[PDB]
Amino acid sequence: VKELLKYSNETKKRNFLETVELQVGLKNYDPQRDKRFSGSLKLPNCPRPNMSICIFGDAFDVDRAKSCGVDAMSVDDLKKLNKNKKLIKKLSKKYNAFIASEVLIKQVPRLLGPQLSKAGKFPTPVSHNDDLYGKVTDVRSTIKFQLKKVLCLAVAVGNVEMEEDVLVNQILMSVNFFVSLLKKNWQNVGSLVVKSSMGPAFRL
Amino acid sequence: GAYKYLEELQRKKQSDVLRFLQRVRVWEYRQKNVIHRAARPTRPDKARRLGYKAKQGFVIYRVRVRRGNRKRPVPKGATYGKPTNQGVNELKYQRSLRATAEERVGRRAANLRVLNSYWVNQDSTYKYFEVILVDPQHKAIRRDARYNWICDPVHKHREARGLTATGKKSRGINKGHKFNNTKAGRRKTWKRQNTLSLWRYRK
Amino acid sequence: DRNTAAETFKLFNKYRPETAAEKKERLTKEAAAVAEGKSKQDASPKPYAVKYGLNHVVALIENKKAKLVLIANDVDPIELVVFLPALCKKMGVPYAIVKGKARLGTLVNQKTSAVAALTEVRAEDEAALAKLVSTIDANFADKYDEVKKHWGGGILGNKAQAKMDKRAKNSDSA
RNA sequence: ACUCUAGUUUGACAUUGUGAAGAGACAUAGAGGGUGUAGAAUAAGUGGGAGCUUCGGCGCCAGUGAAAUACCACUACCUUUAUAGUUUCUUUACUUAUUCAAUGAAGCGGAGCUGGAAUUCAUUUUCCACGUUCUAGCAUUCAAGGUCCCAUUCGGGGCUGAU
RNA sequence: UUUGUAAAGUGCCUUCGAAGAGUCGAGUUGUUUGGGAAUGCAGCUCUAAGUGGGUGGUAAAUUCCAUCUAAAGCUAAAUAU
RNA sequence: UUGACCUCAAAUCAGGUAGGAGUACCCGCUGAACUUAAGCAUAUCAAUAAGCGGAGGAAAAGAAACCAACCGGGAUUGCCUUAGUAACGGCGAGUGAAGCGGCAAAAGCUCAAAUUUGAAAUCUGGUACCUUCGGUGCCCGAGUUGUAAUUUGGAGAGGGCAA
Numbered sequence: 001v002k003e004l005l006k007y008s009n010e011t012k013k014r015n016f017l018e019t020v021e022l023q024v025g026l027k028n029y030d031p032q033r034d035k036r037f038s039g040s041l042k043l044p045n046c047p048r049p050n051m052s053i054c055i056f057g058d059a060f061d062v063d064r065a066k067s068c069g070v071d072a073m074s075v076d077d078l079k080k081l082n083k084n085k086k087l088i089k090k091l092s093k094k095y096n097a098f099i100a101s102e103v104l105i106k107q108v109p110r111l112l113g114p115q116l117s118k119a120g121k122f123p124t125p126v127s128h129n130d131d132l133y134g135k136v137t138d139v140r141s142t143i144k145f146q147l148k149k150v151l152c153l154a155v156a157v158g159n160v161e162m163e164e165d166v167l168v169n170q171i172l173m174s175v176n177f178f179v180s181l182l183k184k185n186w187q188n189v190g191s192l193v194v195k196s197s198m199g200p201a202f203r204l
Numbered sequence: 205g206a207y208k209y210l211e212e213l214q215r216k217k218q219s220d221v222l223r224f225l226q227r228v229r230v231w232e233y234r235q236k237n238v239i240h241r242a243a244r245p246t247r248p249d250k251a252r253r254l255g256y257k258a259k260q261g262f263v264i265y266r267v268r269v270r271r272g273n274r275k276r277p278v279p280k281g282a283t284y285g286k287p288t289n290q291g292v293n294e295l296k297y298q299r300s301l302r303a304t305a306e307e308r309v310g311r312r313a314a315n316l317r318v319l320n321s322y323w324v325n326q327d328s329t330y331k332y333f334e335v336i337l338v339d340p341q342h343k344a345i346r347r348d349a350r351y352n353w354i355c356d357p358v359h360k361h362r363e364a365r366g367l368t369a370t371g372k373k374s375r376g377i378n379k380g381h382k383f384n385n386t387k388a389g390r391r392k393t394w395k396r397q398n399t400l401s402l403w404r405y406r407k
Numbered sequence: 408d409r410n411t412a413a414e415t416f417k418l419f420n421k422y423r424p425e426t427a428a429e430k431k432e433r434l435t436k437e438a439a440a441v442a443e444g445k446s447k448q449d450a451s452p453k454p455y456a457v458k459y460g461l462n463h464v465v466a467l468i469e470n471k472k473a474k475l476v477l478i479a480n481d482v483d484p485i486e487l488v489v490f491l492p493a494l495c496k497k498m499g500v501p502y503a504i505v506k507g508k509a510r511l512g513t514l515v516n517q518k519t520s521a522v523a524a525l526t527e528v529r530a531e532d533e534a535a536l537a538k539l540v541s542t543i544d545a546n547f548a549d550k551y552d553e554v555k556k557h558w559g560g561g562i563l564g565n566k567a568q569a570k571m572d573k574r575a576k577n578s579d580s581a
Numbered sequence: 582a583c584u585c586u587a588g589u590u591u592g593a594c595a596u597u598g599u600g601a602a603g604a605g606a607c608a609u610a611g612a613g614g615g616u617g618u619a620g621a622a623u624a625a626g627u628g629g630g631a632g633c634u635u636c637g638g639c640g641c642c643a644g645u646g647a648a649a650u651a652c653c654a655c656u657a658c659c660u661u662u663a664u665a666g667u668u669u670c671u672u673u674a675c676u677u678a679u680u681c682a683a684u685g686a687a688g689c690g691g692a693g694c695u696g697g698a699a700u701u702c703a704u705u706u707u708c709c710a711c712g713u714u715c716u717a718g719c720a721u722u723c724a725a726g727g728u729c730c731c732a733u734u735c736g737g738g739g740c741u742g743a744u
Numbered sequence: 745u746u747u748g749u750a751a752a753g754u755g756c757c758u759u760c761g762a763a764g765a766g767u768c769g770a771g772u773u774g775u776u777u778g779g780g781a782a783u784g785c786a787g788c789u790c791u792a793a794g795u796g797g798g799u800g801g802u803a804a805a806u807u808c809c810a811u812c813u814a815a816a817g818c819u820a821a822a823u824a825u
Numbered sequence: 826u827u828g829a830c831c832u833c834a835a836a837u838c839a840g841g842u843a844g845g846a847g848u849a850c851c852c853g854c855u856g857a858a859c860u861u862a863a864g865c866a867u868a869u870c871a872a873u874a875a876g877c878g879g880a881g882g883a884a885a886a887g888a889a890a891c892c893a894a895c896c897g898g899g900a901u902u903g904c905c906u907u908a909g910u911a912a913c914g915g916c917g918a919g920u921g922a923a924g925c926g927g928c929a930a931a932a933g934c935u936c937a938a939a940u941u942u943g944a945a946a947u948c949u950g951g952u953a954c955c956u957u958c959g960g961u962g963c964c965c966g967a968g969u970u971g972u973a974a975u976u977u978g979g980a981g982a983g984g985g986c987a988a
Binding site for chain 6: 260
């Protein structure tokens with residue numbers, strides 16, 4: 001049971017001395033192969049925000065560059081091209097669509113590296129910009145499977161009370177367990193080294 | 205009670221305690237005779253559930269039997285027949301070694317009646333058994349009717365007609381589709397199905 | 408050792424079971440009492456005998472009712488008594504391994520006993536019982552893990568021991 | 582000739598344990614190690630992230646590169662076994678299983694005494710003996726000598742002789 | 745003689761409910777069977793389990809079901825002569 | 826030093842028991858070959874004769890770790906049928922059961938595994954007496970490394986309640 005330890009709860013709130021937004025970090029554990037397709041390739045909806053600052057480089061076109069003046073972070077176009085390739089790095093993640101797929105070959109060397117662009121794995125080029133902006137400013141997690149065995153993500157903030165953080169780590173355990181392929185070993189939740197940013201690690 | 209602990213200890217025979225006790229006891233029993241009296245059972249749980257009520261007139265013998273296949277007689281390995289029935293070495297003796305042990309200690313103690321027998325030990329050369337013989341004309345057995353049935357004259361030499369616990373095993377007797385050739389005893393259910401039944405009015 | 412064993416068997420000499428003549432005496436007592444006073448087997452006082460028998464002592468250790476349990480450095484079918492130090496450590500009952508199953512038999516009027524157990528005790532000998540429990544747990548039940556780790560045996564005979572001493576003094580020293 | 586067969590030869594498993602050598606990695610944490618471009622700077626990769634410590638100091642930002650750090654962790658990469666159990670190799674070493682032989686199971690092993698080969702580098706560091714050799718004789722009575730008892734009877738007992 | 749404040753059975757609730765290992769099972773080998781990728785026995789080798797085990801007549805894995813309790817024991821008459 | 830314990834012995838110790846015969850039928854081990862295949866090496870005869878160990882008036886088997894797959898049957902044995910069938914077989918010669926169904930006969934049960942622990946309550950032998958295939962007292966002995974009572978798979982145990 002996750003009730004005797006903290007794992008999302010009130011018990012670890014005074015262990016860290018930084019009075020800034022410090023988020024909790026959960027790490028999954030299930031052995032896989034050296035392939036690139038197997039595993040947990042899904043980024044679901046996180047119901048409570050991660051409480052982070054992020055600005056979006058919306059480089060849209062005719063039918064989608066109007067809904068950014070109500071609920072968004074930054075309004076950009078496809079004409080401003082001589083900035084996002086050479087100098088500027090003031091971003092956390094972007095958001096694109098399907099209508100302009102010939103500009104994506106240009107911003108490869110600068111943004112694909114530090115996770116500022118999209119290759120194939122995150123739902124970044126989603127068309128809908130009138131309903132999916134109530135899901136990205138409430139910052140989601142990062143499910144990114146590495147080489148041999150780890151899955152480093154982030155659930156919530158330690159200073160947030162245990163009322164908002166009661167059904168967030170449970171719906172995230174129902175994503176890496178049901179969408180998973182049949183090439184994972186026994187008892188898919190093996191080890192959960194859960195440490196936030198500053199205190200000790202609290203595991204099951 | 206204390207017999208469940210002995211039962212569960214005796215079910216773990218490759219642990220360190222039981223292999224030390226195995227080695228000490230196999231040496232001690234090899235230093236003695238083949239058929240010799242045991243003053244007291246070495247497995248009181250396993251002797252007790254086979255029928256050892258420790259009182260007067262119950263006897264434990266301990267017995268070695270020579271281990272391995274049954275090499276045939278017929279001198280210099282010649283059988284003088286078909287090349288089917290021509291093997292001398294690899295023949296394997298339809299009764300168990302436990303039945304040989306029971307028959308031998310029922311021939312030495314010939315006044316006594318064998319009830320059952322159990323395994324105590326083995327090395328590469330011998331298997332060692334304890335046989336649990338009952339003296340049927342002692343007055344602590346001839347009454348108290350839980351054990352006076354062994355007094356009956358039909359129970360003479362149970363170990364040499366196949367009526368002990370390993371006798372009825374090695375005779376193939378059990379219920380089933382698996383035991384069809386030998387379920388009522390093999391040779392009676394052979395002779396009754398090679399009998400030509402002919403009536404008065406021929407059916 | 409013999410000092411604590413002598414104290415322990417003074418204490419267990421104070422608690423012996425009934426011999427046959429004492430049972431004949433209490434049969435005469437209850438045969439008078441039930442026929443006259445109609446006291447159904449309660450005119451005689453409650454006994455305080457030692458508890459003996461191996462199934463009995465194992466049931467008393469399983470139900471936590473035994474105060475003190477003695478074990479013999481004995482019985483040749485050893486499997487009868489190797490599980491009793493583990494039971495007595497697991498159930499918290501203080502236990503000692505006293506020398507001889509003849510003495511455990513003669514403080515109980517048998518030939519061999521192989522177990523002994525106090526469950527009841529009168530109010531006279533309580534402090535002596537507690538001092539025995541203290542000394543016994545200083546020797547046995549608090550050293551259970553250290554003894555469970557160590558391997559005995561390997562002791563060579565004195566001719567091979569002397570030859571090993573000669574060689575291992577001639578292999579390193581001069 | 583076709584098909585076998587007792588015997589014998591060799592391997593594997595068991596009987597079959599116990600110490601000391603030599604390689605494979607686990608319970609067991611941590612000191613440190615891991616230099617193709619760019620970037621204060623040796624970022625093997627990933628997650629949080631604009632701040633912490635009294636201060637200093639670093640960090641956000643800035644800029645860079647496939648990877649942005651102060652601060653706490655996971656997977657790992659190469660060593661370090663200081664701690665305990667198991668893998669095949671040295672045939673090294675063990676007595677208790679097992680095997681051989683001998684005797685009516687007679688002197689096995691260890692230590693000392695005295696001497697002396699032995700030279701003293703402070704006192705013995707060491708090693709050997711520890712009853713018999715001209716003779717076709719003898720060797721046996723809990724053993725004679727020496728010592729102490731008993732209650733002095735005619736005898737009987739203990740030590741030593743023979744560590 | 746009345747063997748006797750003893751024994752036995754029936755109904756309701758509660759806590760339990762102990763059940764047989766070098767044995768089951770398996771590999772190989774011999775033998776046997778009608779038993780067919782091994783029916784029974786036996787030799788060696790390995791060796792269990794507990795909401796378990798065995799059987800369900802083509803070997804195997806996966807998910808269910810069914811049916812009985814092994815490795816301890818006694819017992820008339822039908823039957824053979 | 827004396828007394829127990831354990832293990833092992835000795836007695837023309839007290840009292841018992843075993844062997845041998847008969848073997849028609851029974852329970853096991855062991856086990857051929859003539860012959861058949863129009864030859865013969867698997868096969869077949871045959872799981873037979875011979876040999877050996879053991880009983881009884883019957884023996885054996887027997888109260889399902891069974892058969893089934895049905896609307897399920899219910900220990901064992903034997904008879905009629907299944908059935909010359911399914912199956913095995915140089916798929917040759919040949920071999921060859923079982924469940925169901927009708928009937929004869931139907932009888933069910935016992936230990937081990939749970940402290941009786943306000944009481945080994947159990948059993949043997951000797952001695953004395955007698956209403957002497959046995960009963961009572963006393964005395965040793967067995968036995969708590971555990972005999973009796975309670976329970977045994979279908980139930981059952983410890984408690985509580987009313988008949």
